[PDB]
Design a protein around this nucleic acid. Structure first.
Ligand SMILES: [Zn+2]
Lengths: 81, 71, 215, 98, 129, 97, 130, 36, 24, 210
RNA sequence: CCGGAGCGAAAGCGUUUGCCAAGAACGUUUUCAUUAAUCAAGAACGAAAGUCGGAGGUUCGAAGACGAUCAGAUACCGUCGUAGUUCCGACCGUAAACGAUGCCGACCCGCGAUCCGGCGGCGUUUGACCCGCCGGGCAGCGUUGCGGGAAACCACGAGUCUCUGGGCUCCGGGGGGAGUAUGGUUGCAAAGCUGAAACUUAAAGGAAUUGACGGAAGGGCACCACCAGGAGUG
RNA sequence: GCAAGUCUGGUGCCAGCAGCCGCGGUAAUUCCAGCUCCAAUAGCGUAUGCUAACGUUGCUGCAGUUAAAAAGCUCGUAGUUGGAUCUC
């Protein structure tokens, strides 16, 4: 949100769920922001780069948290098809 | 449920008009009764002549004598 | 008298590792220590007891009377909290509810009515809270209308920072215990309603647990 | 308030069942609502099977059994301690007691 | 029976959106639905959709972007003039900053903002925000 | 609070009308390891019953303060409670061979 | 029947001192009186009475309430046990026909350590209802 | 004596304790004492 | 019981018709 | 792992067949139907070993992403995975709850046994439902060795395998411990790991003395 | 045999066999081409009891008689027993007629059974049985229900209603007076449908919690209780 | 409720107050008065209509499992409501 003059008036921009584009509320304790490390092409060791994914509590409680991360890993070329 | 048809203005107008008579506050002000039985006949005040001096007792749990007049 | 944190979240905010309270709300981190709340908002934070409702428990020898305390706390801009505590003495019930009302302080998103000039004055959209049977609908209002609401939810809306509103409650609003919790629930959805201005892709940042892992 | 989802009987998709009569009180109780108890016991109880075995004219004669179909109404089944009251959550267990 | 196929289309979208789905299949296809889904797509509420064309009414499979809160219809489909359009915006739209009311005017099926610029009224199909 | 600040064990202050039908307000303030039975109730907690007469009547003051365990000191009793068995730490003997 | 005060104090004795206590009530009473300061003399004998009773259980096997370093070292030694050959390192592996088709879809379906086991006819894997 | 001792008794008296203002007054406590 | 109050009203308005039919 | 060096070799698939990691019981969860290859004639569901390897490395990536290894919690309530998670915690450096998970360990801050990790790893989602449900009140992710008849109520990385079975569960904890160490600077990935998979196998008290 | 099984619009429906007409589901690359959905005043059906005219009348049994029981007992219990209970023809159109939940349509969780039709698969047994799939139907469990609600509870939705609109009919407006009075109407009658008012009242009621209580069940404890006894007391 | 006296004297379920809940049973913050205080103010109280309160007449916008509530069920005309499709 802006103030029609370039002034961002939102005190904090919440994280949207990487699986359902849902706003992760400040009191959504079941929410998860899991990091998935990236490996090297030639040796496959941890270099320091990782990928961030946020899944809200509703998707996680429903049981579609592992399928969402699986599809998100295939999109970022983490796990094989 | 309700009929949301675009030509149901007659059904809605007739249904609402009939169900208003099941209202105790509406049927009291739009009938001959409750006005013919009203001694004042729809007036604010009324004059009269005192006939007796009767005292009715207060209902429970109160205990007193209410000083009334037969007018 | 000195604060000794027991959770790793309190250790970070005590060592000046977490700058603003928004980082806690950004990552949905649970605030289990009340000393973290007044660490950031302790300067301007004014509470108010809404009602002391005595509850009774029928026993073999009589009624055990306990007293609740519905305390509404807020910084009057963007943060509001509500806490309920039922103890035997009224003094310890009020002190216990202020601690719970601080732990429940949530951010408050505010928007504009039509044009956008200055600062947000009302709710961004029509949000509706629900608790028990009483529901309250927070509707945006023009710039200078003020909080058009009952005296009970008006305290929550003034302590949250909302200046203008057009509320419409339905249900047993005589129950202040459910009326206040329903109003506090309607303010919880201001930062949970996806609007077109929040359609940009989320850029993630290191969480305070990860940024200060070794510390 | 509704105490049982099955209304205390077993009738799904029907309107009327044949009412049977109880055993110890002769009360008309529906066939599905009645508390049945199939008791299969020998004609000679264990206290007299030895005396009958000694008085038996055969060498290997298995004593018969007495098949009795009992239909109890809810009033008499509880009074006879055939069934008892259970907890609000322990009422849903339909498995018979071992 | 199946009346107001546009209602069954937006109800299927609104449900599948809250369940977190990515694609929703609409059983009956109609030009009124396609004109409605195009307005929702031009404002960034739904993605692309394939009009599956069998030799019947036809089906549609719409992609969902997670940006839609609720899409519904106005069942009686009242006649909205250019003066009464402001009243419908306050009741249906959750805010004066977003949300649209899809109308049906002589210039075609469009939202309420475009009806103000073209200076024409008509009938109201529904809303989305 | 004065007993807690000056002392270790809690106390109990009951200043109201105990047996009545209109003054029947117990108003009991109990906290901090209050013993009521047994023989150690004598040398571990001392009771004080005083009276305060006012315009509306007379009120009683029942105070039961418990003293901490102080060895050979006038602060508290020099004997431990019977329901307490303190075991010393095991000897750290690294010189095994 | 002992109470919690003697039950608790008796277990802490064994956890801290194990190379000193014995199986006799009179000997355990002496060492318990020496290291532990028990106010009552009857209560002191109650603790020594239950401490000696736990010795017959500890000498028989481990207990869930007391963890001594003589029985933990035995668990730590058997936990680090490693056989000479791996139980998974077999020379002949018998697999069914369905799992062979799964390995064939993979990039390695030709393995010498595989015996295609033919499942028996009929599907009677469920339990009879009733 | 009495056959039913657990009874009302007098006209202005009852078996249980009742106040004239439910705690409030100048001779008894029990009124609104919340914020003190 | 509510079924007996209905039975009394049935027997009450039944004799009301008797004392009303006899006067005509 | 989609590269060429992150593909399982012949010695890895032989251990899965020897232990029984592909056998997945008779029941099937609708959330695990993508990890099952085909149901057998005796009702047994065969778990795809290739998809298990992909979820294993995906699980190992999240573990290495945790800077402090102690922030990883490895909980196993059943006896079948008690010593397996203890050797896993020692091989990596994470915490563990091998006994009984006390309710309120993650929520009751004033409790003595209070530990707030950054990543929870349970053995069986059904048997360890209490640590999973309790971890939902906090922002603790979950990596679970999920069988076919295992609910994914609070599972973030479901590893399809035969969680029940001594040789099966012990191998999975050994496989994950190796991949986490291989992704770090500890194992060269060319020489086989010195630790044998029999160190993670739970032994009954009847077979220990022999 | 007989089931939380089937059928029927409901009420209701259980020996064999035959006859008459009808029906759901399934199958179809058959046909018609919007003929549809819900429906005021109308109409069919409609448990038990009751009414009218015949036949019949074993058991049971209103009323009634008598024998008990009790302070009384025209009740509960027992012995006899009328109308009824069964059939035929014609009325009454009433039930806790209940899933206390109208009908049609769309979207919406999972799993295992069950009845019917169809499809496929590997054997066993002379169609039966075993493993899946599809449509329809009576239901169940897990949902600690993505949701709903005052709870209880609800996936035959009571879900997709303040983010309030698929179509339509009936119907509720604090509790009593009262389904009463009167009028109309129907009926042989009993009664059905329609149906107020004067007046009276601050509550009535729903779900759940704690306690108390039970001539409710289970598990335990003392001679201020008892069994077996000793002293008595009156 | 609803801004404003644990004040003083009198009365003792009497007289009276009270829209409602209630108050008065010899120590009444509620009656009769003194003092004090509060609210609006040249105004203000009361009685009866009417409107908003009332989403308790609900077109917007109510309900009908258990709180008042879906006809016992089905058929059936008026009435209401009706698939897709023709230049994009
Ligand atoms: Zn019986």
């Amino acid at each position: 949100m802006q103030n029609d003059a370039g002034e961002f008036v939102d005190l904090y921009v919440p994280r949207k769920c990487s699986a359902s584009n849902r706003i992760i509320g400040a009191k959504d304790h079941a929410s998860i922001q899991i990091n998935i490390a990236e490996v090297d092409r030639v040796t496959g060791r941890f270099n320091g780069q990782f990928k961030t994914y946020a899944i809200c509590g509703a998707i996680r409680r429903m049981g579609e948290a592992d399928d969402s991360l699986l599809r998100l890993a295939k999109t970022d070329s983490i796990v094989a098809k | 449920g309700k009929c949301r048809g675009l030509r149901t203005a007659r059904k809605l107008r007739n249904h609402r008009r009939e169900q208003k008579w099941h209202d105790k506050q509406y049927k009291k002000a739009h009938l001959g009764t409750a006005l013919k039985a009203n001694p004042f006949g729809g007036a604010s005040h009324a004059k009269g002549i005192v006939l007796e001096k009767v005292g009715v007792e207060a209902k429970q749990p109160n205990s007193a004598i209410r000083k009334c007049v037969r007018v | 008298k000195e604060w000794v944190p027991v959770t790793k979240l309190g250790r970070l905010v005590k060592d000046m590792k977490i700058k603003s309270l928004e980082e806690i709300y950004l990552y949905s981190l649970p605030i289990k220590e009340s000393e973290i709340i007044d660490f950031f908002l302790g300067s301007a934070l004014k509470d108010e007891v809404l009602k002391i409702m005595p509850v009774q428990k029928q026993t073999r020898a009589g009624q055990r009377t306990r007293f609740k305390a519905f305390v509404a706390i807020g910084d009057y801009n963007g943060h509001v909290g509500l806490g309920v505590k039922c103890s035997k003495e009224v003094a310890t019930a009020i002190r216990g509810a202020i601690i719970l009302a601080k732990l429940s302080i949530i951010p408050v998103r505010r928007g504009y009515w039509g044009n956008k000039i200055g600062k947000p004055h009302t709710v961004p959209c029509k949000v509706t809270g629900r608790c028990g049977s009483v529901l309250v609908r927070l509707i945006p209002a023009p710039r200078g209308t003020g909080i058009v609401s009952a005296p009970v939810p008006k305290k929550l809306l003034m302590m949250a920072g909302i200046d203008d509103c057009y509320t419409s409650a339905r249900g047993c609003t005589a129950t202040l215990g459910n009326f206040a919790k329903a109003t506090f629930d309607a303010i919880s959805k201001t930062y949970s309603y996806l609007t077109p201005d929040l359609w940009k892709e989320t850029v993630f940042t290191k969480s305070p647990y990860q940024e200060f892992t070794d510390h | 308030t509704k105490k049982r989802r099955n209304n205390g009987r077993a009738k799904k998709g029907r309107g009327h069942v044949q009412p049977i009569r109880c055993t110890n009180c002769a009360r008309c109780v529906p066939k599905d609502k009645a508390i049945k108890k199939f008791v299969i016991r020998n004609i000679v109880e264990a206290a007299a099977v030895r005396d009958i075995s000694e008085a038996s004219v055969f060498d290997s004669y298995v004593l018969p059994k007495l098949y009795v179909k009992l239909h109890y109404c809810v009033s008499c089944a509880i009074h006879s301690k055939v069934v008892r009251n259970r907890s609000r959550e322990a009422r849903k267990d339909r498995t018979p007691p071992p | 029976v199946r009346m107001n196929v546009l209602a069954d289309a937006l109800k299927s979208i609104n449900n599948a959106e809250k369940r977190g789905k990515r694609q929703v299949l609409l059983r009956p296809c109609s030009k009124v639905i396609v004109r409605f889904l195009t307005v929702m797509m031009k404002h960034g509420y739904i993605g692309e959709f394939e009009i599956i064309d069998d030799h019947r009414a036809g089906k549609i499979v719409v992609n969902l972007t997670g940006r839609l809160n609720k899409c519904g219809v106005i069942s009686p489909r009242f006649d909205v003039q250019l003066k009464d359009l402001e009243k419908w915006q306050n009741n249906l739209l959750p805010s004066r900053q977003f949300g649209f009311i899809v109308l049906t005017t002589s210039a075609g099926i469009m939202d309420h903002e475009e009806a103000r610029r073209k200076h024409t009224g008509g009938k109201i199909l529904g809303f989305f925000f | 609070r004065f007993i807690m600040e000056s002392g270790a064990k809690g106390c109990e202050v009951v200043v109201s009308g105990k047996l009545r039908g209109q003054r029947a307000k117990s108003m009991k303030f109990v906290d901090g390891l209050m013993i009521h039975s047994g023989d150690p109730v004598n040398y571990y907690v001392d009771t004080a019953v005083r009276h305060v007469l006012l315009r509306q009547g007379v009120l009683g003051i029942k105070v039961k303060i418990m003293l901490p365990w102080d060895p050979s000191g006038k602060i508290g009793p020099k004997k431990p409670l019977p329901d307490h068995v303190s075991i010393v730490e095991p000897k750290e003997e690294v010189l095994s061979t | 029947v002992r109470t919690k005060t003697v039950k608790k104090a008796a277990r802490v004795i064994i956890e801290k001192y194990y190379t000193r206590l014995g199986n006799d009530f009179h000997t355990n009473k002496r060492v318990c009186e020496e290291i532990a300061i028990i106010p009552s003399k009857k209560l002191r004998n109650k603790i020594a009475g239950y401490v000696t009773h736990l010795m017959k259980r500890i000498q028989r096997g481990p207990v869930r309430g007391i963890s001594i370093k003589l029985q933990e070292e035995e668990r730590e030694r058997r936990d680090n046990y490693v056989p000479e050959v791996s139980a998974l390192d077999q020379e002949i592996i018998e697999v069914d026909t369905d799992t062979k088709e799964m390995l064939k879809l993979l990039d390695f379906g030709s393995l010498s350590n595989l015996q295609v086991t033919q499942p028996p006819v009929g599907m009677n894997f469920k339990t009879p209802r009733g | 004596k009495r056959e039913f001792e657990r009874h009302s008794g007098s006209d202005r008296s009852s078996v249980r304790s009742e106040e004239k203002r439910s705690g409030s007054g100048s001779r008894n406590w029990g009124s609104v004492r919340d914020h003190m | 019981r509510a079924k007996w109050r209905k039975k009394r009203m049935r027997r009450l308005k039944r004799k009301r018709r008797k004392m009303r039919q006899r006067s005509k | 792992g989609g590269l060429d060096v992150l593909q399982m070799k012949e010695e890895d698939v032989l251990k899965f067949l020897a232990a029984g990691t592909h056998l997945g019981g008779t029941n099937l969860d609708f959330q695990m139907e993508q990890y099952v290859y085909k149901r057998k004639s005796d009702g047994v569901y065969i778990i795809n070993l290739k998809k298990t390897w992909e979820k294993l490395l995906l699980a190992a990536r999240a573990i290495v992403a945790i800077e402090n290894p102690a922030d990883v919690c490895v909980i196993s309530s059943r006896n079948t995975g008690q010593r397996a998670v203890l050797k896993f915690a020692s091989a990596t450096g994470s915490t563990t709850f091998a006994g009984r998970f006390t309710p309120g360990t993650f929520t009751n801050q004033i409790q003595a046994a209070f530990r707030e990790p950054r990543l929870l790893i349970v053995t069986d989602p059904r048997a360890d439902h209490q640590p999973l449900t309790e971890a939902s009140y906090v922002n603790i992710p979950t990596i679970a060795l999920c069988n076919t008849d295992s609910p994914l109520r609070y599972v973030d990385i479901a590893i399809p395998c035969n969680n029940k079975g001594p040789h099966s569960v012990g191998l999975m904890w050994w496989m994950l411990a190796r991949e986490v160490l291989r992704m770090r600077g500890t194992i060269s990935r060319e020489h086989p790991w010195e630790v044998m998979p029999d160190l993670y196998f739970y032994r009954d008290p009847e077979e220990i003395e022999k």
